[PDB]
Paper text:
In this work we explore the structure of TuMV virions and VLPs to unveil the differences in their architecture and understand the contribution of protein-RNA interactions in the assembly of the virions. Using cryoEM and following single particle-based helical image processing, we have explored the structure of the potyvirus TuMV and its VLPs. TuMV virions were isolated from infected plants of Indian mustard, and VLPs of TuMV CP were produced by its transient expression in Nicotiana benthamiana plants.
The cryoEM 3D map for TuMV virions shows a left-handed helical arrangement identical to that of earlier characterized flexible filamentous plant viruses. The atomic coordinates for TuMV CP show a central alpha-helical core and two long arms. The cryoEM map does not show density (we could not model them) for the first 65 amino acids at the N-terminal end, a flexible region exposed to the solvent. The last 16 residues at the C-terminus cannot be traced. The N-terminal arm of each TuMV CP interacts with other two subunits. There is a side-by-side interaction between the N-terminal arm and a groove in the adjacent subunit mediated by hydrophobic interactions. After a 90° turn, the N-terminal arm reaches another subunit in the next turn of the helix where the interaction is favored by complementary electrostatic potentials. The dual role for the N-terminal arm that supports side and axial polymerization and the nature of the local interactions (hydrophobic and electrostatic) were also observed for WMV4 and PVY5 and seem to describe a signature for potyviruses. The density for the ssRNA is clear (red density in Fig. 2d) and each TuMV CP subunit spans five nucleotides of the viral genome. Residue N103 from one CP subunit (Ni), and the pair R204 and R209 from the adjacent CP (Ni-1) interact with the phosphate backbone of the ssRNA.
Author numbering:
A (entry chain K), C (entry chain B): 118 to 272
B (entry chain A): 66 to 117
D (entry chain J): 222 to 272
E (entry chain C): 170 to 221
RNA sequence: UUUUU
RNA sequence: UUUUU
RNA sequence: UUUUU
RNA sequence: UUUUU
RNA sequence: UUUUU
């Protein structure tokens, strides 16, 4: 990224802090297009997508698995002020306003964590999947519906 | 903090090394799509019919 | 080309930047005639074709395979503004407005790229071909329907 | 026909919204492609007629 | 090529594990995949090991 | 803790 | 391990 | 993400 | 055994 | 490898 956006600065600190949020409120997959944006007061200075994705060797979740507790405390605060809930449950119909803590697309389970919420995490994980298959292969390139003739036309 | 779409470190062809060919002043070029095609003909032809 | 159009300039930078576009919006084959053109404001200063084709040793795709990511970001921008889609799918009936990214006539697959769009790329590649054959030879030149007589007429 | 769910909203009506959403759909498929343009049922002959 | 009695594969069958470790390293750095699957549509980034 | 029309 | 838009 | 006449 | 551009 | 108007 440092080669891409040409900062020569640790402002990328602030940038990636931005990327946390659009990463949160919406899905996580290579199958993304459009843009994203954050704000500065009332402004909406936009930003692109792709090279933050085409330039990691494992996937996007496998890199963002770090940024766990920061957004955790984030939602703790701004939920303590007001009844925020994220997107990912509102499509999947959570019930408890308390259990916003783990309505993420991504997380890493650890041995410091409660019992109850695990159930919703895993059930709502797998059941939120369906239908899409491993379905390995697409189709091959060598597509000659016929063989070369290897002859000659003459009068 | 703001920036632009196009870049310079991108993988790009090179006549010789220092040269970058797709000169990055092309920010402003988006005419009508169909206007550029071959499936529509040209303005000159459109004139000469109208005159013939 | 530098011998042909006699610039003594790197304006050919801008020219070839033009050639990107007519190269994009329409097919790529030796079987081309007519002209092409770009604009300057509202003007339509035209330009010819052939010597950009008769003067490369492998084919035209095999040279334009470079200019990949430039037009990629191009369409990213001008699609982000407005619902552009190119030609090549509109003849082949794409469905998703998002997947304009790879409705080209040409591209080089790489190991930084998604899974999904590959399917449409290859399927719509080969199925967009049909009927045209390898069909090597045309016909030969030595066409004497008869043999010389090698005689004489006399009274 | 349309709405955006938010975190200020009740529990009950969500059920009817989503059930009546998806069940009001049926049958219509993703069904990507139509058909292609290059439709030559034959190949050019590339010959000549003479007497 | 014109100077081996059996074919080219039948000689290059030696050089197996060297390029194997090669791709192990330079894949461990970065998401490389070779050509031969990208024409044939592999799926797993892990299974570059045998897209020869 | 929620769930009381 | 992947697959959660 | 799309697909609700 | 050959035949994988 | 070629062959996508």
């Amino acid at each position: 990224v440092m080669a891409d956006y040409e900062l020569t600065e640790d402002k990328m600190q602030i940038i990636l802090n931005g990327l946390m949020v659009w990463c949160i409120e919406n899905g996580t997959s290579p199958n993304i297009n459009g843009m994203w944006v954050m704000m500065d007061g009332d402004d909406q200075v936009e930003f692109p997508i792709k090279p933050l994705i085409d330039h990691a060797k494992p996937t996007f979740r496998q890199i963002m698995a770090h940024f766990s507790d920061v957004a955790e405390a984030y939602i703790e605060k701004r939920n303590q002020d007001r009844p925020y809930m994220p997107r990912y449950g509102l499509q999947r119909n959570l019930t408890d306003m308390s259990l916003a803590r783990y309505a993420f697309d991504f997380y890493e389970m650890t041995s410091r964590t409660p019992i109850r919420a695990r159930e919703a995490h895993i059930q709502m994980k797998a059941a939120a999947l369906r239908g899409a298959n491993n379905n390995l292969f697409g189709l091959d390139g060598n597509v000659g519906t016929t063989v070369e003739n290897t002859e000659r036309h003459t009068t | 903090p703001r920036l632009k779409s196009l870049t310079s470190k991108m993988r790009v062809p090179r006549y010789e090394k220092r040269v970058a060919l797709n000169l990055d002043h092309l920010i402003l070029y988006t005419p009508e799509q169909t206007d550029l095609s071959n499936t529509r003909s040209t303005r000159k032809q459109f004139d000469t019919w109208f005159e013939g």
